[PDB]
Amino acid sequence: AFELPKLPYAFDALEPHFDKETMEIHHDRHHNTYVTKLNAAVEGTDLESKSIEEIVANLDSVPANIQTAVRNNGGGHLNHSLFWELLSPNSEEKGTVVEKIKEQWGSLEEFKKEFADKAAARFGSGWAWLVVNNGQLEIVTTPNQDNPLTEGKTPILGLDVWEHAYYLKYQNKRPDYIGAFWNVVNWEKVDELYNATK
Amino acid sequence: AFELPKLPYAFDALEPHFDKETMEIHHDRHHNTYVTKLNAAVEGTDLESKSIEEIVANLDSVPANIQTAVRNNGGGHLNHSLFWELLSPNSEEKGTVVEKIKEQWGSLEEFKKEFADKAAARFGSGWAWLVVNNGQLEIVTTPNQDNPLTEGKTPILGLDVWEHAYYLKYQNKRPDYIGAFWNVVNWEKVDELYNATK
Ligand SMILES: [Mn+2]
Ligand SMILES: [Mn+2]
């Protein structure tokens, strides 16, 4: 069923912000494992022929016996597939969302400050998200590989704050990693995901 | 009130099992942060002059306004204080508990298998525990910095499977880390904690 998407750039395309060793491991091992376990959980079930977005949006309906496996690895598959596409070696802070951000938060900087506090505050493994909730933009975080789509909020930007995403280059300094992320945001993709809600 | 406990050995004393850079960061930053934040949550209160074990044990009646900070950072302070004392550069597979394990699981290698499978199955950030409950041994894992003492079960052995504990040396290879752990278990301390429940 599901497959591991190829990266849209080289492992080292995001240095010096995200290190090449991490990009390789993160994608080829961690993501891939999410795919393997996800396929095992869904094979033989109604979920097999569903899209990853459809599975995660309707995770509350998934049978109790495979719900955790799908929640965690389906989560994993969706979240990382989004993540790779939301990164870019030549981020431009412009476009539809940067403008909606500017209008809602006053500055792009004010927005980053709020995103960074919430992302740093996520205790344990999780993700920080910019989501649209019924037309309105808001910053939420989730534990582990949970995704706001499960609660009917469309994510348009996400940062992975599992320690495996930053430890090799940043060790404990998660605030420095979040700071480096801004330089590699794929705002074009962010736009594409926002405009898909309209 | 609370203080960062000193390590009973050198930063490099557990090599080649747990690397020295990890031990230093793990102890000086990660554990220290749990201590700083716990101190902020309990200062000027009842809890300040209590022992970390009794705080964590009676977390369920700690007022809802500081519960999360105590749970996370107190739990953090407890779990790591146990962890450092539960490790040794002079590890020796004998004693009261080894014998009980032998009796209950059949062998050490059987008990290790079940411990290693559960430790590897803990999704996200967490700990794997050997606990005394109802005068029997039981393997359980907990999320984040939760400790089975809160659910009335006395832990006697504990393994940190937060990615910070192993990423620098093992990266994604959590099983290899669990494998190395066996070589530095301080079973003299496990005996002491087990015998304290009698
Ligand atoms: Mn990840
Ligand atoms: Mn730890």
Numbering used by the authors:
A (entry chain A), B (entry chain B): 2 to 199
How is this structure described in the published paper?
For example, Staphylococcus aureus has a constitutive Mn-specific superoxide dismutase (herein MnSOD), which is catalytically inactive when loaded with Fe, and a second one (herein camSOD)1 that is stress-induced and cambialistic—that is it can use either Mn or Fe. This cofactor promiscuity enhances the pathogenicity of S. aureus by enabling it to survive the oxidative burst of the innate immune system while experiencing host-imposed Mn starvation. Each monomer presented the characteristic fold conserved amongst Mn/Fe-SODs, with an α-helical N-terminal domain and a C-terminal α/β domain connected by a loop. The active sites were enclosed between the two domains of each monomer, with both domains contributing ligands.
The crystal structures of Mn(Mn)SOD and Mn(cam)SOD were determined by molecular replacement, using B. subtilis SodA as a search model, at 2.07 Å and 2.30 Å, respectively (data collection and refinement statistics are provided in Table S1, ESI†). Superposition of equivalent Cα atoms of chain A and chain B of MnSOD and camSOD gave positional RMSDs of 0.232 Å and 0.229 Å, respectively. Most of the differences between the structures were found in the loops connecting helical elements within the N-terminal domains. S. aureus Mn(Mn)SOD and Mn(cam)SOD can be readily distinguished by their 94 GHz field-swept echo EPR spectra. For Mn(Mn)SOD, D = –10.60 and E = 0.63 GHz, similar to E. coli Mn(Mn)SOD; for Mn(cam)SOD, D = –10.66 and E = 0.43 GHz, comparable to the R. capsulatus camSOD; and for Mn(Fe)SOD, D = –10.46 and E = 0.33 GHz, which were the same within errors as those previously obtained from simulations of the Ms = –1/2 ↔ +1/2 transition. In the S. aureus Mn(Mn)SOD, the ring plane of H26 relative to the Mn–Oδ1,Asp167 bond was 180°, while in Mn(cam)SOD it was 167°.
